Design a protein around this ligand. Structure first.
Ligand SMILES: O=c1ccn2c(n1)O[C@H]1[C@H](O)[C@@H](CO)O[C@H]12
Ligand SMILES: O=c1ccn2c(n1)O[C@H]1[C@H](O)[C@@H](CO)O[C@H]12
Ligand SMILES: O=c1ccn2c(n1)O[C@H]1[C@H](O)[C@@H](CO)O[C@H]12
Ligand SMILES: [K+]
Ligand SMILES: [K+]
Ligand SMILES: [K+]
Lengths: 241, 243, 241, 241, 240, 250
């Protein structure tokens, strides 16, 4: 391996310059299988990586695990291997009453409720997605006619207190996050997830292109959801090769 | 008879306008409005000069913000009270990237928040991000006139001098926070400095208003008219797509 | 034409002046200048209108700053380049104390730094404090004409609306930082709100420049003024030449 | 399932109140194998879990994945299922010159270079280990005579820039972390890893007991990446049942 | 006269002492020293009163810190200059858990840093953590002496009043940061408030000095607004 | 005692509304000796208090101990007892080359390098002195005849790393304070001391008047250090000034 965690070499990529990066290792093969010539590359820790082909060009599918820290490892090591464009495809809880389960959300930028993004840029720097990538995702969502919402996502280092969940062991939420969901709602934030702030900040501050699309699995106020978002990211990738 | 404290405008003055182009300098307001139909002066108070015009049958506002986030936040809030829901910032700017030359145009996707006013709308974690539709329209408009365009991040500073790490000053000093900062933004891909976008983009993105920003490059510290006109044609053409 | 980037002034225009009175509104510049000897227009560019006059045979500058720290920081810097060493801000203001009434005059000893520009000169730990000689001159000028004067702390905000906890706005919301903030400043004895002094005082106190500030109360949140605050700033200038 | 991520029910725990939590899903089976009656429970995402028995009491082994965010999910859901004591067994990079690869490091408390700890307690709160757990770990290390060091650990949300690694795609480290390793070294910090700040903070602030131990796999005074602790964590567990 | 600026002590005065017991109150120094052999008064300047004594044949220093991190930081630094490498604070404290009784003994594993001086040694992310051997000696000493003992986190405040969310004050105002804070620390399991441990533990842990912290409960805040001394002496014996 | 630490009652004050607050308990008697009929009231921990009479009015002298935390206790408890005006008198090391030993420093406001101030007001709030107190101190300095500097003071929770001293056990200074003395120098900060940030902030944010004056007994930039009596003649000067200022504030 050329890299410490992923267990991949530059040759494994066969010239790939774009990676699709879901959180769940189990989702990796499902995405690769939608493209031509899917081949498993490696599986270490939460990092499962496959290669496939899109319109004749090699593409990587590599899981990030949950959270900015493992995401930052996958992105860095893929970048070392030659990836310059990253498309995250994830799941998300919506926090706006008008956003229905199964909807598709394209993230323009993220509220940085993580710690890893700070390891790349100070908080003043925007966790902003690449324009080409965001455009490709939006245009891909339109081509398949999905109900799409485009805007800001809150990206949290926790699933529970940072998304102001009280249904927990302690039932306590620290002061910083008490009342935070309503605040994000009033500010027009669409949804919560846990990787985009790190992904977008680390890419935008290092000359890498990143986009973020997600399928709505719950509304904080199903099957064809993932499929739709997954279709969208693969189609978007075609436009970015 | 004004409905707002600073702008000296009433809702009626807007004639149903829902979009405003917002340059910094009052002296540029008529010139922009003059590119559109039936331009008329509305008012002039402090750094807030407003004109109404018409674009493909729809009323549009052109209103200056003055220099800096504080004045901008006043113009934007009061225009919002008056019914504006879409704001397009037009400016001329320097650049901090060597590959960016005078004559190029910059469309800002999001800004580094080196201001104070943005914090009065959203905590620092919140992204000073432009509206997708506005950014799209600005890029496509730049495309239609064949402008050499750069799309990316802009550093938005409450100062012209130390926050842009200028040392040619009275004190010749730059506070620790900003010492070495220009090189840091350069390494992070930041295109340029200006002084209003962090405030504009943050206050709009966190209050359901659409904002975008375009600027012509007139200078570059690492290394004019046409550039300006281009930027202005771009912002007017973009406004047409957003009505 | 100009020794500075924005003001459109040369050192020659100042005729040796070392003190500037700095109102916010360009419209007020001529009025202040008119109270002194030999008043003449200098220049007008953006929100920076400048006049020169004379007191006791010494040149004095009057120059507007525009609204807010950013434009203030430009005016003060460029005036400092041209030789100004003492700055007296004159404003009108809204009081936050029940017993500070319209028509009262406020002299600011130091400001609560609710701005961004002050941080471009000194870290937050540094006091946005007025120069003692300036504050003395203003207080003594105020007493010499019998104004009802309050001396103390001013809250200096980058916004007119949320930073001063105004809810009569488009969104009707105030970010967490500022919710409940007016009552807090009130309990801490803060006199009033305005928008330029944190920047002015900090940038002067941290770079060997003298600054003071006086303001007329023309309204009170908890419920001819110009002429008096203006008379005070000119009489104070007389004492500082 | 009783919880959203782990795919476990309280019944799967068989009354277990202690969990050993490695970062790598592949280490779980190996840890479980050192105990009696090892049984696989589930594997979802980076969360692989096994049950075993120690001195006739059920014990859980469950991986956390890399980083605070996924750790916070595993700990929370284990807590919901009934776990009250958590022993992290990790790998680590030493930052002191005389720590040998293979050495066992027991963490008393962590430098919070993560984001997730802040979702449980403000930064002022110490990421401190439980005294009984730390004691059990030290005493267990003593009983097998491993080379052991006890002290403070820097816990980072990144593998690369937050641990001041420069052999990366960008080769740059953000201002906050430039010169940081030398600083921690001067302060006597022993090592870097990526989970303890979150684990220790979230446990200490919610009435859960946590201990932290790791084997050194690289010495950072010499290189950024490499070309006993497990026995100790199991023995320590015995003492805490 | 004195090898350090504030304490008025010389390296000679310590007679090779490498451990110091550091109470807050100068008036308690003589009392503690008296529990050991050959107690001799050394110096008394400002809030810094110091005695030397002997414990199982070895020199030991007792030196007051005064109230608060700043004065503590001076005493610890200057004692370190004179050769002290182990510091055991013995204090008084208000419990904030209902289950902790007055007269109970609290051993601190780490402190909530509600002080400013700790930041002069390490950034906020660094833990104000006690030395493991010192903490162990205190817990073991507490068994030996016999006392109801709790081991855990302590909130260390730069103020006695607003930082411990006391309202019995001139202004009756508690700043936003501290409004509701006691109940927050309570829910997070914090045992008690005092005013020196965050500075002490942070400055020691970040400078290769060993520090431990024990205190006797003199009030319980959920109700209103000699074991510890024997314990700190016994712990010192275990650390020489 | 009406208060938890000071061992004082309202009766002890005899209607006093002004307190002079040196840091060192040993200085309290010395300052009181500059006034009429001084009597010792109490001594507990670092808090030694005396009452004296100034132009026929009761005045308290009470030590604060070193640092914002003990200072906050003294000021708060004195406020409870009825004190409304506080004058700190210190001795200090200057950091400007032009500020000479023997000079007197009057502080208009302080750089908040302390923790206790934050327990009264967020960092944005200025650690600013009361105008009447500052005026009285400046005027008294002129009555006494001192060479006076008026301006900003850096108020640190430590004597060592926070004042960027490297002559210490570890010989290291945390990142925050590395290079900080040169920064404060460039910003015109006059000196370091350790109580004013807390004092000035807690008073300005609670309707209390506070001023600060100090005698310069050493300069961080100069090689030579005044003899056995670095303070004494200078100390005496600042003390005479704080008493003379108190006269104007009664
Ligand atoms: O509310 C949610 C729902 C889903 N997700 C999100 N928050 O975090 C993302 C994690 O990777 C993982 C955590 O369940 O899935 C994404
Ligand atoms: O330098 C290192 C070496 C090992 N580890 C550490 N940093 O982070 C821990 C991660 O879980 C994972 C990162 O590889 O293993 C632990
Ligand atoms: O609530 C309390 C009670 C006692 N103490 C504490 N807080 O601070 C410690 C101080 O040294 C001093 C404060 O009175 O005593 C310790
Ligand atoms: K993970
Ligand atoms: K302006
Ligand atoms: K003290």
């Amino acid at each position: 391996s050329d890299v410490f965690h992923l267990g991949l070499t530059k040759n494994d990529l066969q010239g790939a310059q774009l990676a699709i990066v879901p959180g769940d290792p189990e989702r990796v093969e499902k995405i690769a299988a939608l493209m031509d010539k899917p081949v498993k590359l490696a599986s270490h820790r939460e990092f499962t990586s496959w290669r496939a082909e899109l319109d004749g060009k090699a593409v990587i599918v590599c899981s990030t695990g949950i959270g900015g820290p493992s995401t930052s490892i996958a992105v860095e090591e893929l970048a070392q291997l030659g990836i310059r464009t990253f498309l995250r495809i994830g799941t998300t809880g919506a926090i706006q009453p008008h956003i229905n389960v199964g909807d598709v959300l394209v993230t323009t930028a993220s509220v940085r409720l993580d710690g890893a993004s700070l390891h790349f840029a100070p908080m003043e720097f925007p966790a902003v997605a690449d324009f080409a990538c965001t455009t490709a995702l939006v245009e891909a969502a339109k081509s398949i006619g999905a109900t799409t919402h485009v805007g800001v996502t809150a990206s949290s280092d926790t699933f529970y207190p940072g998304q102001e969940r009280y249904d927990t062991y302690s039932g306590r939420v620290v002061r910083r996050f008490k009342g935070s969901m309503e605040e994000w709602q009033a500010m027009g934030v669409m949804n919560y997830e846990m990787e985009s702030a790190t992904l977008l900040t680390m890419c935008a501050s290092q000359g890498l292109r990143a986009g973020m699309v997600a399928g709505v699995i719950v509304n904080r106020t199903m099957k064809q959801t993932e499929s739709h978002a997954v279709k969208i990211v693969v189609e978007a990738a075609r436009r970015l090769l």
